[PDB]
Curated annotation (Swiss-Prot), chain A:
Changing S26P: In LQT1; uncertain significance. Tetramer. Heterotetramer with KCNE1; targets to the membrane raft. Interacts (via C-terminus) with calmodulin; forms a heterooctameric structure (with 4:4 KCNQ1:CALM stoichiometry); the interaction is calcium-independent, constitutive, participates in the proper assembly of a functional channel and also acts a calcium sensor. KCNQ1 channels interact more strongly with Ca(2+)-CALM than with apoCALM. It is found in: Cell membrane; Cytoplasmic vesicle membrane; Early endosome; Membrane raft. Belongs to the potassium channel family. KQT (TC 1.A.1.15) subfamily. Kv7.1/KCNQ1 sub-subfamily. Abundantly expressed in heart, pancreas, prostate, kidney, small intestine and peripheral blood leukocytes. Less abundant in placenta, lung, spleen, colon, thymus, testis and ovaries. Mutagenesis experiments were carried out by expressing in Xenopus oocytes or COS-7 cells KCNQ1 mutants either individually (homomultimers) or in combination with both wild-type KCNQ1 (mut/wt homomultimers) and minK (heteromultimers). This is Potassium voltage-gated channel subfamily KQT member 1. Residues 7-19, 47-61 are annotated as: Interaction with CALM. Changing R3W: In LQT1; decreased potassium channel activity; no effect on CALM binding in the presence of calcium; decreased CALM binding in the absence of calcium. The chain holds residues 364 to 533 of 676 of the full protein. Changing I12D: Reduced protein expression, probably due to misfolding and proteasomal degradation. No detectable electrophysiological activity. Reduced electrophysiological activity in the presence of KCNE1.
From Swiss-Prot, chain B:
The modification Phosphotyrosine is found at Y97, Y136. Residues 74-144 are annotated as: Necessary and sufficient for interaction with PCP4. Signal peptide: none annotated. The modification N6-methyllysine is found at K113. Its main location: cytoplasm. Ubiquitination results in a strongly decreased activity. One of its GO terms (biological process) is regulation of cytokinesis. This is Calmodulin-1. Belongs to the calmodulin family. SMART domains: EFh.
Amino acid sequence: FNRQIPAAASLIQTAWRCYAAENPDSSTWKIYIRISQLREHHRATIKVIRRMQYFVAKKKFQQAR
Amino acid sequence: QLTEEQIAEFKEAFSLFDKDGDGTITTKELGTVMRSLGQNPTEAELQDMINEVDADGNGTIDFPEFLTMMARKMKDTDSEEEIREAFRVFDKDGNGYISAAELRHVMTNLGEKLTDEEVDEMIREADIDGDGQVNYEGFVQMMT
Ligand SMILES: [Ca+2]
Ligand SMILES: [Ca+2]
């Protein structure tokens, strides 16, 4: 019943995680518990992946419309 | 639009995925990076991500594609309208506002499931008046 609900939330969530990652002291950087000390090469690949996941969540929201 | 330094920063980011050095990014290389961050993607997850960036459609990502994706103005490229309609799925019947408690429920328990600390940042920055009612139209602009 309404597939738009998950796709909508995921588009908001990915868009915000993409926006929050531009702030390097954001709480969004705490979610990687498996990384001992977060270095700059982690942050560079994290921003790329988050952008990729935003474009996917955007597509799936589009498809559910 | 783009500086010479941002392009160089994107070239270094491209090199971290392109472990082989052949100038393209495969689904297997993306899966290696993501697992190094504690993620556990599946082959469809990785192929979904690659298909959104692969222009030609060969299944691989070259640096022009990578740079095109990283430089997409995801603020004016008709994105604000879709995030707005995403909020409208849960909108308080037409309102244009969303309960801070309702936003926390959707952000924490649905979709990607953000952390409780992440929702605090989102609510605090989006609750301009501090009343527990966020207008997302204004929040969308802040993100963009
Ligand atoms: Ca490669
Ligand atoms: Ca390609």
